[PDB]
Each structure stands twice: as structure tokens, then as C-alpha cells.
Scaffold this active site. Structure first.
Site, PDB file in Angstrom:
ATOM      1  N   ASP A 192      16.783 -34.137  39.605  1.00 53.77           N
ATOM      2  CA  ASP A 192      16.551 -32.989  40.465  1.00 53.77           C
ATOM      3  C   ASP A 192      15.068 -32.773  40.725  1.00 53.77           C
ATOM      4  O   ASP A 192      14.592 -31.642  40.714  1.00 53.77           O
ATOM      5  CB  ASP A 192      17.182 -31.726  39.854  1.00 53.77           C
ATOM      6  CG  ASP A 192      17.268 -30.563  40.854  1.00 53.77           C
ATOM      7  OD1 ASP A 192      17.305 -30.828  42.076  1.00 53.77           O
ATOM      8  OD2 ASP A 192      17.293 -29.392  40.414  1.00 53.77           O
TER       9      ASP A 192
ATOM     10  N   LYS B 282      11.974 -31.954  42.618  1.00 54.52           N
ATOM     11  CA  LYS B 282      11.523 -31.272  43.824  1.00 54.52           C
ATOM     12  C   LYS B 282      10.377 -30.318  43.453  1.00 54.52           C
ATOM     13  O   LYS B 282      10.271 -29.919  42.293  1.00 54.52           O
ATOM     14  CB  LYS B 282      12.685 -30.504  44.459  1.00 54.52           C
ATOM     15  CG  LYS B 282      13.433 -29.594  43.498  1.00 54.52           C
ATOM     16  CD  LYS B 282      14.656 -28.963  44.141  1.00 54.52           C
ATOM     17  CE  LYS B 282      15.306 -27.972  43.187  1.00 54.52           C
ATOM     18  NZ  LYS B 282      16.601 -27.447  43.694  1.00 54.52           N
TER      19      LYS B 282
ATOM     20  N   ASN C 171      10.908 -27.312  41.050  1.00 55.30           N
ATOM     21  CA  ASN C 171      11.024 -27.573  39.619  1.00 55.30           C
ATOM     22  C   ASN C 171       9.727 -28.024  38.932  1.00 55.30           C
ATOM     23  O   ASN C 171       9.775 -28.555  37.828  1.00 55.30           O
ATOM     24  CB  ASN C 171      12.161 -28.572  39.372  1.00 55.30           C
ATOM     25  CG  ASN C 171      13.532 -27.979  39.660  1.00 55.30           C
ATOM     26  OD1 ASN C 171      13.701 -26.758  39.722  1.00 55.30           O
ATOM     27  ND2 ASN C 171      14.524 -28.842  39.814  1.00 55.30           N
TER      28      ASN C 171
ATOM     29  N   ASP D  16      13.234 -27.047  34.231  1.00 53.40           N
ATOM     30  CA  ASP D  16      14.633 -27.102  34.696  1.00 53.40           C
ATOM     31  C   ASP D  16      15.268 -28.485  34.497  1.00 53.40           C
ATOM     32  O   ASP D  16      15.357 -29.280  35.442  1.00 53.40           O
ATOM     33  CB  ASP D  16      14.761 -26.669  36.181  1.00 53.40           C
ATOM     34  CG  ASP D  16      14.449 -25.184  36.420  1.00 53.40           C
ATOM     35  OD1 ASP D  16      14.201 -24.426  35.456  1.00 53.40           O
ATOM     36  OD2 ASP D  16      14.467 -24.766  37.603  1.00 53.40           O
TER      37      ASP D  16
ATOM     38  N   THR E 199      19.690 -32.100  44.486  1.00 54.24           N
ATOM     39  CA  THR E 199      19.488 -31.290  45.670  1.00 54.24           C
ATOM     40  C   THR E 199      19.471 -32.242  46.866  1.00 54.24           C
ATOM     41  O   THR E 199      18.594 -33.089  46.939  1.00 54.24           O
ATOM     42  CB  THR E 199      18.176 -30.490  45.566  1.00 54.24           C
ATOM     43  OG1 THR E 199      18.206 -29.697  44.374  1.00 54.24           O
ATOM     44  CG2 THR E 199      18.015 -29.558  46.751  1.00 54.24           C
TER      45      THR E 199
END
Length: 802
Positions: free
Chosen positions: A643, A645, A648, A661, A678
Site C-alpha cells: 500500500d 502511497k 502512508n 500503516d 489502493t
């Protein structure tokens, strides 16, 4: 008749409707060809070979409908994908007729990727029939196909002798280079005389061997050929022709060179690394150092009864093949067989005369390491000093305090080490006293004690490192528990001359937070700093006045989506993370679950790039460089993040990044298949459902760089519908705007955003080395990044939270 006087416990959407229409139906040629045709046009299935599509075609189920019957509703959770076999079906979006679909057409495309709420309702106009398939079945079938293909190919890698000296990681990497190749009866697989560069392995079927147009033998399943063609440019010795229908797993040298590098070079490095590591000296050498020794070693073949060495500037000797006998003058001291080695004495004492004799017992192959070969490996002519220097470096590079300092800082620190000796019973450290020294045991043994014995430490152990960062009482005593013990030591005064403020502040604040063994009742919530899942509170510890962050995961939230096994696996990953650019966990609590972590006060990277606008090269280098080190760290521990991005990634008080996260992160064991992440950042291989690993985070890295340099997202920037994001990810064109003036930036972006992992920079055997050495980073000091010696792009004025 008595009774039991106990008690006895009792027992207690789209898939339900399609169950009403399901019927058995034998598939004809006409059906299979329609399915095959329809799936070849489908987003996920277009890349699949015929045997994969034929397998998927068989799992399709027949569904019979009457005119007027409901198939799909609008707003209900999706699950099936449909191909119309007969009749007509009308599409009604917002209770308004749009299209009319017949034989050959398809709908419910998105359902084969994820649980999505449908757009329109599909009703049946006339009596008609559908070929259908669920997500579960479809993803499971794609999983099993690719996974068995991989396992089968790996077993055949294992049966081929030329791959025997590849490591686990190397074998798994080339398993992905296997291409399946089908041959009908009559087809020639290879022809005598051709300079081919492809190994072939028979999975199923049989093939006939012809030397000089004359049948030599027949080849059955498992038999292979062409292993020499991966090493050398040579003609085929035979003409192999398929007798019956045959499937061959094949590996081309061109792809192997991309994935693995030169196969001879890699094999020899493994052989040499294993041999060199039998010596206690070369164990402390880095993998690079040993690889360099392997690449530069003199290899020689000797006849039997030959004096390989006698009374030459050879320091080390390795038997690759055969046997040699070792002599001190006239006394035999042993026989070295295949893989054994000699010369520890002379490696450590550069100037010492070679007193021994080595004599071959049979024809043999020997690798020799000279004085120049060690000097070149180590970077200088003082071999004795460099080996000592590196022995110390190996020790301190395992400690958090030292491992992220620049090489110049680490070298100066090592050089400042001083040596002292202790008599037995001497208190090296006395508990309660304020220390100013860090120790490494050179020789002997010591006893750790307090109030009774706690531990025993010896050669190359360390102690007292906290005295470099803090002025505090020693919590234990260190008694010399041996004859004449020697310690290397460094003074705090010297450490503070070497380490600069920003790194020192990082260490001071980080090591402290393990000492505060806090409790929930000692925390007072100042304010809220995040929402969701749950809520994140800024908390103030009363005893120490240190400020922390407290995430609050609700029980009813986690139990709702069945994340039972995921929260425990998340805690495990989050607790084990000990890197400067990853959030550091302190402890956990329960009653709702809690994560107590360090407080990060500089806000999200999402907002920072938006404050900066389009990042310049130095700014993009810094942030992407920082993310690279955090992701590399996780990949080395077999953790895929999944994840990545800007949301985070937090920024600390000094402007350096913190990855947060880890809800999507996973300890990788083989190929992962679950669809998580995502959408805008998700890698093609995740979407296509044929297996993925840590390589997905490198794709995500490319997406981030694109955002940094170009501005918008590379795929699906306008799009909100998830199907259309995945479509753009899978088949969209990657473009770059006219204002992007840097050739190297684009090159890196294109190669990070390579769709197939095999051609993606950072996904070969070298790993992140290829990313770090890319021309984009040409003027970038990686050494100074980890040590906090770079001005970051943005430093927050005061604290900032969402």
C-alpha cells in the site's frame, strides 16, 4: 426412565439468484470457441495462452433464463461475469433502456477483479442462456494455474544439474523466466548445427533424437537438453523432433542474463563464497568483497604430483576439483578435497614467508587468491590493517547506533578505537557509576552482574553503548572473568566529535523510548491527530514527559470485515520494524486494540509535495531515496508493503520520512494472490491474478516518482470507477508532459513502471542496487541520506497534523 438434567446448543445475495438458473450442459466445439473468443478480448484474459483459456473455459457454467427474468440488479454487490450464448438481453441503467446484447457479447467484466456494486440492470428480452463464472472460482482457477506452473517449472530447475549451485533466491528468480512452448507431432524443437541459446525441458509427451539424420534415442517426460547453450556459444549436437504432442518449459540465455546476470559468474561466486566462508576471516567480509574475490581469483588446472605452492605471492588456495596434500617441510598435515581451502595464516600476516608446500595428488582445479587480489578487494595495500578495520566494522554495523552513520563517520570511529587490558576480577564497569565509554571484547570473557549473575560475553561481543548517548548510572557491572582480557574502546568525547546534531538527536530520542515501560493509566490525551478503522490520539506520558502517538483500533471494526488473523500479523510486522525511516512501535495494549508509537510531527508527504508543487531532481531524489531504503529494509525481511502511497508516509521534526500503516503489509512465503492495495498505486501483476511478490512496491515507487516529477498520477488520474483505473493500469499508454526536461527521470519512471516484473528495474538479482545506481541518482549521496547529513526538501515550522 430418567431424563438428561444438563444443555444442548442449537444451530443458526447474487450467488443465490444464479443458483435458480444453473443447469448442467455438455460443452460442444461451438461453445468452447465462443468462450475462447470472448475471453481473448477480456481485460485480464487477453495475455493468457490457449491451455490457460481452455481451462478457464471449462469452469464456465450454463444459466438458463426466461424472457422477463432478472439477471443482474443495479446497486447490488457484483460477483459473476457473463457471455450471452443465446437470446437477447437489454441493459437498463437508472431504469432506462440503453443497449441490446446478443450472442457473442459480454458483461459483468469488473466482477472478475473485485467486489463492485453494479451500474445497470440486465434483463432478458427473449428466452436466452448465459455462460457464467464467479470471482471466487475465476481467481482460484487463475491462482492454481500459475502456481502449479511455477512449482512444476521449479522442480525441473532442480532436476537440471547446471543450476545445482544457484541459491534458493536465484532458482526462484529464474523459475519466472520459464516460457512454455508447445510442439505438435513433426515439429523440430532444435536442429543440429544451429547456435541456439535455449534450454528445453519435457513436461509432457515424447521426442526423438537424430544425430546425422539417424535415430539415436527417444526422450521421455523429465528429459532435458541445452544446458551448455546457457553458458557457451555452441552448435546443437542433435536434431530433436516431437513424436507426439509435447509441452516444453524453456529458458533463454537472453532473459537469464537480464534476470540473473552471467550464469558462469554467478555460479562461481556461490562456489567461492561457500568455500571462503569456511574460514573465520572471510565470514566477516561482505558479500560484495567475496564476489570480487571470486571474479578476480586465478583458476588453474594442474596435473597430478605437481608442486602448486613451494616455499609466489599466493595467500589463499581453494580446491575446486580433485585433491591436494599439504606439507610443512617434510610432514604431511592433511589432504584438501573439493571445496576445502588453506591459507588463514598468510591472509592475516601479509609479510609472512610462505612456509608450507601444496602438492596435487590427482589432476585438479585450483583457485588462488594473491596479495594483489586481496588488496584490490579491500581497497588498499595494508591488508593486515584493513582486515582488522573490517572486523570492527562488521561488529558495529550490526548495531542501530552505528549502522546508519556515513562510511566516513564509521571509518573515523573505528580508527579512534583504543585497546586496554584487564586482570581477572577487575571491574571493567561498576554499576551505579556514570560511564563515558563503549566496549568491544577483543580477547577473553566477561560476566554481566546486578544486585547475582545475568549473562556471559566473549570475543566480539559489545557493551555499554548507552554511555555514548546519555549521562546515567550503569545498570550492570562487567567483571573480567578470564585470564588477561582485552577490550577495544571509544570515548564519548570522540563519538561527539564525529556524530553531528541531527543524527545525535535521532539516536537520543529513539533509544530513550524503550526505557519508558509505560502503562495506559500514565497516558493523558492532549488532542486527536487522526480518524478512520479507528482514531489516533496524541498522548503525554506523565512520569517522563515524553510525547507519543496512540492509534485506537476498534474491536467491532476488525471483527466486522473478518480481519482476525490480519491484526495479529500486523502487530508482528509493526513491532519488528527497526529502521530510521519506518515508524517505531513502543508497545501495545488491549481491552479495542492499541498501537503506541513515536510521535511524528511534520505531517504527511501527501501534503508536503502539494506545498512544494512539482519537485526538482534533488527533492525527488531525497524523498524517493528515503522510501527506497524503507522498502528495501522490508524486502530483506520478506515483507511486501502493498500500500505504498504518499498518504502512508509521514515527515518527522527534521524533515525525514517515516513509513506508517502496515495494515496491507504481509510476510511473503511464495507467491501472494490476494487483491489488496489502493487502485491507483496497484501493480499490474496484482490485478491479473497470476501471482506476485515484493516487486509490487517497486511499481508503486514508480507511481510516486511520477507524481513527484510530473504532478498527476500516471494511470487513471481522471478516473473514479475502479474498473477504468485497472484498465488504464493494464493497457493505457504511459506518457510524460512537455515540461519534464530530465531524460534520466523519465528513463527511471518508465523502467519502474514496466508492466512485466522481469523487465522492471530493481527486480533482478541485484535488487535495489540497480535503482540506486541509475543515472537519475548519479549526484546523490546515499551514504549521507541514512545518516541525516542532507538538507531535506521541507522542514516543518512547528507541529502539523490532519
Amino acid at each position: 426412565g430418567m431424563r438428561c438434567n444438563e444443555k444442548k446448543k442449537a444451530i443458526f445475495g447474487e450467488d443465490t439468484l444464479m443458483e435458480d438458473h444453473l443447469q448442467l450442459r455438455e460443452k460442444l466445439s461451438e461453445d468452447i470457441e465462443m468462450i475462447k473468443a470472448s475471453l481473448k478480448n477480456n481485460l485480464v484474459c487477453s495475455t493468457l495462452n490457449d491451455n490457460e483459456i481452455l481451462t478457464l473455459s471449462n469452469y464456465m457454467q450454463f444459466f438458463v433464463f426466461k424472457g422477463g427474468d432478472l439477471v443482474i440488479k443495479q446497486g447490488e454487490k457484483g460477483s459473476y461475469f457473463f457471455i450471452i450464448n443465446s437470446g437477447k438481453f437489454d441493459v437498463y441503467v437508472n431504469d432506462k433502456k440503453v443497449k441490446s446484447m446478443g450472442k457473442g457479447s459480454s458483461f459483468g467484466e469488473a466482477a472478475l477483479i473485485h467486489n463492485t456494486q453494479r451500474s445497470a440492470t440486465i434483463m432478458a428480452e427473449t428466452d436466452g442462456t448465459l455462460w457464467g463464472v464467479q470471482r471466487s472460482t475465476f481467481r482460484a482457477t487463475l491462482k492454481q494455474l500459475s502456481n502449479r506452473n511455477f512449482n512444476e517449472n521449479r522442480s525441473f530447475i532442480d532436476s537440471v544439474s547446471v543450476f545445482d549451485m544457484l541459491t534458493e533466491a536465484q532458482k526462484n528468480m529464474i523459475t519466472n523466466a520459464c516460457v512454455i512452448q508447445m510442439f505438435k507431432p513433426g515439429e523440430t524443437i532444435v536442429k543440429q548445427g544451429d547456435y541456439g541459446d535455449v534450454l528445453f525441458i519435457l513436461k509432457e509427451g515424447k521426442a526423438t533424437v537424430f544425430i546425422n539424420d539417424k535415430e539415436i534415442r527417444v526422450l521421455n517426460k523429465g528429459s532435458y537438453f541445452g544446458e551448455r547453450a546457457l553458458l557457451y556459444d555452441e552448435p546443437r549436437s542433435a536434431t530433436i523432433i516431437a513424436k507426439e504432442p509435447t509441452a516444453c518449459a524453456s529458458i533463454c540465455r537472453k532473459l537469464l542474463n537480464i534476470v540473473l546476470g552471467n550464469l558462469q559468474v554467478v555460479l562461481f561466486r556461490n562456489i567461492m563464497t561457500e568455500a571462503l566462508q569456511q574460514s573465520e576471516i572471510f565470514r566477516q567480509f561482505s558479500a560484495e568483497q567475496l564476489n570480487d574475490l571470486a571474479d578476480t581469483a586465478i583458476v588453474r588446472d594442474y596435473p597430478a604430483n605437481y608442486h602448486i605452492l613451494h616455499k609466489k605471492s599466493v595467500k589463499y588456495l581453494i580446491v575446486l576439483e580433485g585433491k591436494v596434500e599439504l606439507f610443512l617441510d617434510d610432514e604431511s598435515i592433511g589432504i584438501l578435497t573439493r571445496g576445502k581451502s588453506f591459507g588463514d595464516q598468510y591472509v592475516l600476516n601479509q609479510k609472512q614467508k610462505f612456509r608450507h608446500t601444496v602438492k596435487s595428488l590427482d589432476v585438479c582445479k585450483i583457485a588462488l587468491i594473491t596479495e594483489s587480489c586481496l588488496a584490490d578487494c579491500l581497497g588498499d595495500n595494508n591488508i593486515d590493517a584493513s582486515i582488522d578495520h573490517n572486523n570492527k566494522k562488521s561488529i558495529i554495523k550490526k548495531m542501530y547506533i552505528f549502522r546508519y552513520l556515513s562510511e566516513q563517520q564509521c571509518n573515523l570511529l573505528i580508527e579512534a578505537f583504543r585497546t586496554t587490558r584487564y586482570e581477572e576480577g577487575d571491574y571493567i564497569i561498576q554499576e551505579g557509576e556514570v560511564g563515558s565509554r563503549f566496549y568491544i571484547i577483543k580477547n577473553g570473557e566477561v560476566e554481566v552482574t546486578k544486585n547475582k549473575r545475568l549473562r556471559t560475553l566473549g570475543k566480539n561481543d559489545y557493551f555499554g553503548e548507552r554511555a555514548l548517548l546519555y549521562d546515567e548510572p550503569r545498570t550492570a557491572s562487567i567483571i573480567s572473568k578470564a585470564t588477561s582480557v582485552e577490550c577495544w574502546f571509544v570515548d564519548k568525547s570522540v563519538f561527539l566529535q564525529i556524530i553531528q546534531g541531527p543524527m545525535l538527536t535521532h539516536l537520543e530520542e529513539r533509544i530513550k523510548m524503550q526505557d519508558t515501560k509505560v502503562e495506559m493509566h500514565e497516558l493523558e490525551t492532549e488532542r486527536i491527530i487522526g480518524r478512520g478503522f479507528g482514531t489516533v490520539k496524541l498522548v503525554h506520558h506523565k512520569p517522563t514527559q515524553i510525547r507519543y502517538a496512540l492509534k485506537c483500533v476498534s474491536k467491532r471494526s476488525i471483527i466486522s470485515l473478518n480481519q482476525q488473523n490480519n491484526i495479529k500479523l500486523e502487530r508482528e510486522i509493526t513491532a519488528e520494524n527497526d529502521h530510521p525511516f519506518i515508524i517505531r512501535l513502543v508497545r501495545t495494549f488491549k481491552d479495542c486494540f492499541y498501537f503506541l508509537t513515536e510521535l511524528v510531527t511534520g505531517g504527511e508527504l501527501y501534503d508536503a509535495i502539494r506545498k512544494l508543487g512539482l519537485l526538482s531532481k534533488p527533492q525527488a531524489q531525497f524523498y524517493l531515496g528515503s522510501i527506497i531504503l524503507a522498502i528495501e529494509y522490508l524486502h530483506e525481511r520478506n515483507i511486501v508493503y502493498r500500500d505504498l502511497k504518499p498518504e502512508n508516509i509521514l515527515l518527522d521534526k527534521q524533515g525525514y520520512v517515516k513509513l506508517i500503516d502496515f495494515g496491507c503489509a504481509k510476510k511473503i512465503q511464495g507467491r501472494a494472490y490476494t487483491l489488496v492495495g489502493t487502485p491507483h498505486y496497484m501493480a499490474p501483476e496484482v490485478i491479473l491474478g497470476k501471482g506476485y511478490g515484493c516487486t509490487v512496491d517497486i511499481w508503486a515507487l514508480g507511481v510516486c516518482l511520477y507524481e513527484f516529477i510530473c504532478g498527476p498520477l500516471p494511470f487513471g488520474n481522471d478516473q473514479e470507477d475502479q474498473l477504468e483505473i485497472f484498465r488504464d493500469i493494464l493497457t493505457g499508454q504511459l506518457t510524460f508532459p512537455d515540461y519534464v526536461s530530465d531524460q534520466d527521470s523519465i528513463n527511471l519512471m518508465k523502467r519502474l513502471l514496466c508492466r512485466l516484473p522481469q523487465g522492471r528495474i530493481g527486480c533482478s538479482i541485484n535488487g535495489f542496487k540497480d535503482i540506486k545506481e541509475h543515472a537519475f541518482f548519479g549526484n546523490f549521496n546515499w551514504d549521507k541520506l541514512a545518516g541525516r547529513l542532507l538538507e531535506p526538501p521541507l522542514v516543518s515550522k512547528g507541529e502539523t497534523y490532519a
